[PDB]
Amino acid sequence: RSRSIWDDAHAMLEKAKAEGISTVWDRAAEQTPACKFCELGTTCRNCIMGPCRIANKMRLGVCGADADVIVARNFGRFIAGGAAGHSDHGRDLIETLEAVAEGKAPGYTIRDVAKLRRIAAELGVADAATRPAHDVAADLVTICYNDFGSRRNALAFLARAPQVRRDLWQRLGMTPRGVDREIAEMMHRTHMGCDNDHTSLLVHAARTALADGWGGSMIGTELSDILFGTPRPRQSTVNLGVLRKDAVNILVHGHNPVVSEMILAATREPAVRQADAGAADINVAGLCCTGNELLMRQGIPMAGNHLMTELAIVTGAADAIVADYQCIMPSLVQIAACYHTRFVTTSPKGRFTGATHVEVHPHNAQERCREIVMLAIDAYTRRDPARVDIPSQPVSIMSGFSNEAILEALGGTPKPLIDAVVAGQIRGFVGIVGCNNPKIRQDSANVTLTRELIRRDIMVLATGCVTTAAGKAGLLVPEAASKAGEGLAAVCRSLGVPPVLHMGSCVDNSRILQLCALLATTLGVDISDLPVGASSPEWYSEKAAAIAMYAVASGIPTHLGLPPNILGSENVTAMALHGLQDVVGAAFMVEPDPVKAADMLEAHIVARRARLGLTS
Amino acid sequence: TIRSRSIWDDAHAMLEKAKAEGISTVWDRAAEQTPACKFCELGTTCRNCIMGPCRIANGKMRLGVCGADADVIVARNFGRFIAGGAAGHSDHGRDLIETLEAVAEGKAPGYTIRDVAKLRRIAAELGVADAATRPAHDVAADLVTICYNDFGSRRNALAFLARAPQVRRDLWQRLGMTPRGVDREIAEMMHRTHMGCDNDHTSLLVHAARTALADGWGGSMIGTELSDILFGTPRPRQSTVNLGVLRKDAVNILVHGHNPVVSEMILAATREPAVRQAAGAADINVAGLCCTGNELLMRQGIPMAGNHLMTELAIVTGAADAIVADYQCIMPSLVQIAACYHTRFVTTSPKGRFTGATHVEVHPHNAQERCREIVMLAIDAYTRRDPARVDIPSQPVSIMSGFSNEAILEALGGTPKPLIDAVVAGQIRGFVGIVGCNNPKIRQDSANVTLTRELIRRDIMVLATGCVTTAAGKAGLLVPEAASKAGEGLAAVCRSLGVPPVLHMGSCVDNSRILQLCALLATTLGVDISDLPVGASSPEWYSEKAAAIAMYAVASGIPTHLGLPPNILGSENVTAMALHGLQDVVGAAFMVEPDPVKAADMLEAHIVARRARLGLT
């Protein structure tokens, strides 16, 4: 009850305890209270002269490092881990398009040639409009790979940012030069006896996160649309009720659409769908970011977010989990073992001990994904009928709101959206990026903050876990306009869109940057002048901090529900919470109270409205 | 009590001088952090997300909040440890590519290509067309491209990897270990260690091996070869060691860190007539520290003031007029210790920023003017030195240095066949590259020198890099006359060649020379590196770069001994994989032994075993 706000989670948690199955909430209590030095960030294991803990003797490390350097180093490596997670996903997308471009990817094509030509033209490919698509693709592959090289002075997509913003980064030393390069430079700087200035460390951490948002994640988003289709607005369902008792239930979990879109195509094969075991159909449901993206591009229903993954298996109806990499809890392998579920992994980078590994690459995806769906149809026969309990009834959601889709709904230009903001019908925009964290009652903060913002005529752009949260709350449909303020509801009914726009997965947060950059460029101001905000009310992962860091560094005020492990240095904390405002035009806000967070987000939005000479 | 800190009299005098002056040393701070955190020492702590942090216990706390066990958690921490060290070398190599490209474009005043012959040879080796006869700047530019591509994401294997025997390359490929890109493997390691990605301890150790190979065969190797191209390939030469290199009558500039791009330009500025005339001092004195000092010693014969733990004690002498630092292994306490005196602590790299220092950023386009400004800062500081607080402890010791692979082969008449013949006869029973640092957990240089003395006594030639250079040098082991401390066979070889029984091959980056030498001997014999009577030791290691070095040695076939254990004892599976499992996979393994004599037995035992596998006595 205190663990989650959802009845489907409640039913599955009670089912888990009766079956003696330990959940992520059960293990969170074992690790609470946690280590104070680890919680403060005042611990360092970067060499075997240590480990060192800073006290308040023990003021410095053995090498002489103070709490400032130690805390900043840990935080840069935290960000580097998150940027690395997106970086590799984007590299994987580059490899796939090259396989298509070279004609070495059976079942893969370029779904959105129009976007390919536009992106290629945008990044400087000559005659991208009229040359053969595979050549245009190959040239774009080269540009992207160069951003994963070490000879650029700035990443390709950075030109989307307003000039004032690009000039600021260059002056500050923040211009991201290469995706992998900045990750390595961060790891270099955090080695003993290298960067021992907390400001320089935070600057490069900002540089590293910008290499994600304007590099790794952005390449990942745009190539995904090129290969799998650009999302259009569409209807679907959410919650554990997406699982059908009468169908073979395949759950795609992780991030890579290269796999999940091939799992979907294999289930649509005539020979596979024919398989014969008491199967009414082959039901595919989404999890995590690969589910978000399958929802965006295919309308496939989503079973749940981060904390719903273990409870999805406990239902007794998950026949298989097809996983790749990132945010896939290893406990899934043990819980699936308690049932019949075949836990299948597909990435060479995402290995789990005890799993069934069927490695998927573009050259063998069609045959391997077809083999995987047969493993699931086999597992559907061994499912115990006694231990099945699908809790809830699914909820309708609308999804597929890319920037392409938003502009289409606005008639082609951002001016109607702009005009609504100048009038005050839409007072501002807040991108909510949150995850789930067992330290917070599940989706309470996410849904509460979302409800507050739309009540104040502030449009919410949702990605990641908040998608399942707002969707379960009925906020992802046009009819949710009745829960928004008069001005925002007026806009939404005019556009036929919900007051919360689902823009995709964690990688797709680059869409929010692209949108902010477009509005800033259209108006001739910096992103730090737009009435925008970002929130991660229930974040947990390195990727969330990398996202939060690149939002702040791009001019977007960013709220965090839980603090990072940096409180052990008040200097680092003050830089993140206040000092960054003077440097990059935005800052971090830490607030566990979602209502106070709405006040803080709205206050900044109001302030930027006044700087534009507008009424709030 | 300070006699237990170091084995050297210059260190003793400075530690006792530090105690009287109330200056806290790295040894004083080591005792404050002992006993350390047990979970951190075991590796059973994880801070990779804010669902945690998590500690594993030995029924609660068996797993992390995400479900991760001690195996995954310990392996993740160790992979990130390796990634930090590879990252340190990676960026140094990237800096040298940037420098050669500046030379190649004519945008680097004072920089030239010292070794055109090596440039043409390296370019030809990596596939540059007509590298032998085309203009040097074009040859350089084409080589710059090859190196940058190894810092890209489109190669299937790094360029220098072809030096390895085919059998070794086939093994890496089968295992999934082939390093594809320098930065790529670092990022992939960080990706794998994110929550919910690689949760298989075997896969994690494999990629850590892949990442370290991207260093030794990539970052460090590019760093070594381009450095020789730009600053000269080391030839054997004489020099002095210890704190006595500092002259009371001269302006004392200490270069500390790693980048020769700066230190070789600091040396040239001191040789300028106006700068040398500006110095009321008797001379301008440049001395080496850490790895940049190793490299100035190798290529210029510049004396070295001391190793890792001697850096703070160098300032306490009261004679260090300036410290020119860049990045890596430069303790931030140096800024506070220098503040107690007149010393100007100068930093030059954008990547190595220290709070409170005098920052004069050095890049190839402005090095000549900036380094000239830095030497003037030091000449200014020479006037502000208090004569009362100066006490230079010891008298310097003669050393011989400059043993690159080029130098070794030259001493052998051009081919490794004489070196090979001595090994088949048994005059040289094997080779051990000692890579150690210093660690306040061990009496300074005790284990290093003790192991070195034991090995040469058993006819085992020692190849020294890094800190052990100052260690063996202070012990009189770096001169031809040190043959009297070796066995009959090894002493016999050394007298024939006129070389010491311990060969100084450079800095930590220069450990790639040892790989190049092993690869050459293995290729010449038609066997794997795992078939050679070779070993590696880091008796007093501490840093991420040392663990990356040890990991890439093990992964290339070289048995590697560590004096102190890494933070992995919390998982017996990871420990057994490092200590035994790797032997079945890569033909070599880690050996953990704090007793240097037992370490010599362990190193010699493996050497003996590989001699038998080659059919030798």
Ligand code: SF4
């Ligand atoms: S880098 Fe410094 S603070 Fe960190 S463990 Fe090593 S000695 Fe301690």
Ligand code: SF4
């Ligand atoms: S990644 Fe897993 S083990 Fe590490 S802190 Fe997070 S929940 Fe704990």
Ligand code: FES
């Ligand atoms: S566990 Fe070692 S400090 Fe937190």
